[PDB]
Design a protein around this ligand. Structure first.
Ligand SMILES: CO[C@@H]1[C@@H](n2cc(-c3ccc(Cl)c(F)c3F)nn2)[C@@H](O)[C@@H](CO)O[C@@H]1Cc1cn(C2(C(F)F)COC2)nn1
Ligand SMILES: [Cl-]
Length: 138
């Protein structure tokens, strides 16, 4: 187990068939979780579970370019529960990131940042106890 915030290096960036697995437990009374796939200061893919946005649970995804957030993609399907162990899997495909939680498909996010081989860091932050962060090629 690791203390958040945690930075997982992605040397030479990401590539199709790369499967990133994040294991942990959501804290009790969690407010937020964030995964940030970064290309330098740009955030290619921000994955942001919010547990109380106007008393609703929502997944927010976005990209940050030149320090500016773009158009949010939102999902009401919310597989996380406070206090419970989770597995987030991000599968890199040619045209999108595919996300599954606890072995159930959640969403896809089309690549806005095109240079996959420069997306060289994954930041993990928010209201979790982080057990592990690793990747493999499927
Ligand atoms: C409150 O900041 C968040 C941003 N955010 C979260 C974290 C964050 C830090 C620490 C932790 Cl531990 C953690 F979990 C975290 F989510 N940092 N930045 C990020 O979630 C962003 C996603 O779109 O939304 C917000 C910023 C934002 C959105 N927008 C609009 C458009 F441009 F997107 C939507 O109408 C205009 N303008 N600004
Ligand atoms: Cl944090």
């Amino acid at each position: 187990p690791l203390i958040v915030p945690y930075n997982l290096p992605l040397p030479g960036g990401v590539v199709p068939r790369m499967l990133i697995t994040i294991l942990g437990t959501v804290k009790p009374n969690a407010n937020r979780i964030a995964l940030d796939f970064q290309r330098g200061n740009d955030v290619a893919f921000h994955f942001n579970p919010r547990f109380n946005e106007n008393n609703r649970r929502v997944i927010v995804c976005n990209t940050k370019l030149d320090n500016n957030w773009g158009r949010e993609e939102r999902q009401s399907v919310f597989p996380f529960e406070s206090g419970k162990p989770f597995k987030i899997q991000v599968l890199v495909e040619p045209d999108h990131f595919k996300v599954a939680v606890n072995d159930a498909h959640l969403l896809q996010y089309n690549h806005r940042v095109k240079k996959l081989n420069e997306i060289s860091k994954l930041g993990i932050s928010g209201d979790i106890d982080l057990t592990s962060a690793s990747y493999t090629m499927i």
